[PDB]
Amino acid sequence: PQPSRPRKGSLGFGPRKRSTSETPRFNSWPSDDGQPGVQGFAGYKAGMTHVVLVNDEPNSPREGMEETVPVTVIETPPMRAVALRAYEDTPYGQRPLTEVWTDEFHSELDRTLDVPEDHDPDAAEEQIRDAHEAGDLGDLRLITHTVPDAVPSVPKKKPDVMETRVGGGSVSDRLDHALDIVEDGGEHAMNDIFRAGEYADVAGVTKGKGTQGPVKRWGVQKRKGKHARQGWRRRIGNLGPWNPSRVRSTVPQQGQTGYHQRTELNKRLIDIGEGDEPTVDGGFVNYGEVDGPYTLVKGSVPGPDKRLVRFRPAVRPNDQPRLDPEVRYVSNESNQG
Amino acid sequence: KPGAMYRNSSKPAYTRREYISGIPGKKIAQFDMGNNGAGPTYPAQVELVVEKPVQIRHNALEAARVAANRYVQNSGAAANYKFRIRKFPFHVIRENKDGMRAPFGKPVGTAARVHGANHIFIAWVNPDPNVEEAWRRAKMKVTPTINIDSSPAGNA
């Protein structure tokens, strides 16, 4: 009869090709609810350890009790909104209008950009306001970049640059909010955007694995029984029926696996601190020591240690926030042994 | 078996019993119904007219007639009316039931050849046309589309 069975692997994360930017790019942003604010931040993955927590869930029969929870440590030092980009609404979607930059630049931002030497901030600002007057102003986002230098364990000094949306009350109000952030020096921090307890969406470029078989890549079976000894162990039965006489792209085949962007949904921010309270004895394997601004993320995060990961207020949360959870213990035990 | 296998008048006329044997008996019970003691001395005379030349197996004739006369008991087992099915299943029909080798079939039944426009049924009624209904049920069991034609009756 041939029993039924779901297909192997999702056809939603394709094509399974190597990512274009190691730095993730959100294709979604939260809704314009609260007061004006930057809708995202970034850090650099460091590692894992567990934390003991007080059951924060009001519906848990264990609410108030001890509870061990896995946590991935992420160094989230301050970042810098170096300019405000404006978009206009056109018959072909949104298009970048202009940009308002600054003069105070991080000593090493030029390892990536051809830093500006002559820019007219006001004119840009004007152009934007005239577009808003005309009513063609599309959302507003800030060009942001990180300060790798600020993170010793991470070799790179060349900053990673990524655009982040600014959703606020009115457009006029948040437009201003934008300009103000920028004008200063763009300097902002995880505290300014997130609060321990809230849910965030963590994007990242997964750990690369090179070319792999379908078994690993799509999760197809290995030849079973007598079939496994005939000369085929990890190759599927066939590439398709006789007709249509062509191999469909839906059939699991070998290829690039890993080093793909993924936006993992609803990640609870256990704690946002600073210092070396989360670091492990011996140091974070293949990473280093943590002693500065950090975020503790519940569970796992895509990517290997040292990789840049991006945060964003969960766009589709299931639970209501349960602010500042009681941390009763953070394990610093060595990750070697 | 289906009417499809015998409803067309495409074969030769095959009726000479002097050369055909083992012909099954007709299922048609009667041809004259109602008050057959009386003669067509009725005010109204409706007829069921076949609209296409076809072959009707005795099967269909019986089923048609029954369904009509059985219904004409809206008038009663000894009601005042006379019903007549004027056609008889003369045409013997075969079936090749070896493959196409020596395929002249064996007698399996009979059918009546009616030509478009002939009346297959004629009923005689007093202004009490329940017969018109007896025929909407009758042509329901014969291949062709049919015309319910009223003759002596300008009592509309």
């Binding site: 609404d89 056109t90 018959p91 072909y92 979607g93 062509r246 469909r248 792209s249 | -």
Partner: protein, 142 residues
């Protein structure tokens, strides 16, 4: 941006096919055409069925592909492509010298071609390309 159209046609309340037919004829005669207010062009019939036809076209496909437009933009243009030997040198030239637009990006109001205008007063069974596109899932950028 900037299209020296020798002719600017206005599709508003005009029968797409009939317009498209005339635009191809001219583009083949060398004329540079631009169609305006595509979102407002119309096609007669029973909306329900009409939509079915187009939704099907969107769904038809495979590895080789069958790219079908959902914007009233594309829709109108592909319609015109069907009226030209778009694979022959001459036909690609003509097709290429034709462009459709959402609304009217010119100063001049385009012209309405003979026998392509539909009378809303004596016609209730018809559809707007834009309505179609909204149903297809297009993003109403107009």
């Amino acid at each position: 941006a900037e299209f020296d159209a020798d002719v600017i046609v206005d599709a508003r309340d005009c029968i797409m096919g009939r317009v498209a037919s005339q635009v191809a004829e001219q583009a083949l005669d060398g004329e540079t055409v631009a169609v305006v207010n595509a979102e407002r062009a119309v096609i007669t019939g029973r909306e329900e069925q009409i939509v079915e036809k187009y939704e099907k076209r969107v769904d038809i496909g495979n590895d080789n592909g069958y790219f079908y437009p959902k914007r009233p933009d594309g829709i109108f243009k592909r319609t015109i492509r069907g009226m030209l030997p778009h694979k022959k040198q001459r036909g690609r030239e003509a097709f290429e010298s034709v462009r459709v637009y959402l609304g009217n990006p010119y100063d001049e109001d385009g012209e309405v071609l003979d026998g392509t205008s539909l009378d809303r007063l004596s016609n209730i069974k018809f559809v707007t390309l834009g309505e179609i596109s909204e149903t297809l899932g297009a993003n109403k950028t107009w």
